[PDB]
């Protein structure tokens, strides 16, 4: 995983944890596509970044993916992010990967859904923001390879990851 290539086009926008049920996974979010400001305004912080909780889910249907693609082709309305397990060290990375695979990856793929995280915009306090956590499904990698081949070449090895779509409305 070489960030030195990909960060030149799309650098990290957030670093913290994801949390659903009671299972957390420390992940760092690389920018992929869309409006980077969307991530800065959606992804909350205080110490570094409180765990993004999964409060909803989008069943990824072929029909849904069409609708998603429609708002994905308009970079401004959505933000595309790549969440990778951020470990302190190699061992820590393994543990985060392990937790992430079992808690988020397996769950999201089992549901065939999008982990929907509602965040409020700082000062606005309106949770009208949807971060869609899509599993490492073909759909995800296909768009990722088209949108960010630079970072894609790094995630091909760390396939156990999430594709997070920040959607306005």
């Amino acid at each position: 995983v070489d960030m030195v290539q990909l960060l030149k086009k799309y650098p990290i926008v957030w670093q913290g944890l994801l949390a659903l049920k009671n299972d957390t996974a420390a992940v760092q979010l690389h920018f992929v596509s869309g409006n980077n400001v969307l991530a800065h305004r959606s992804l909350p912080l205080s110490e570094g970044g409180p765990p993004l909780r999964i409060a909803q889910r989008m069943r990824l249907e072929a029909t849904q993916l069409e609708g998603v693609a429609r708002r994905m082709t308009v970079e401004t309305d959505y933000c595309l992010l790549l969440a990778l397990p951020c470990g302190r060290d190699q061992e820590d990375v393994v543990s985060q990967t392990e937790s992430l695979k079992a808690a988020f990856i397996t769950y999201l793929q089992a549901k065939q859904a999008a982990g929907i995280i509602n965040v409020p915009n700082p000062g606005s306090n309106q949770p009208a923001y949807v971060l869609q956590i899509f599993p490492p499904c073909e759909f995800s990698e296909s768009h990722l390879s088209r949108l960010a081949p630079d970072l894609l070449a790094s995630i091909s090895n760390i396939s156990p990851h999430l594709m997070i779509v920040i959607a306005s409305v």
Binding site: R53, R57, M58, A114, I116
Partner: peptide
């Protein structure tokens, strides 16, 4: 978008 399962 349903309602998943977090901590509230």
């Amino acid at each position: 978008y349903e309602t998943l399962s977090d901590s509230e």
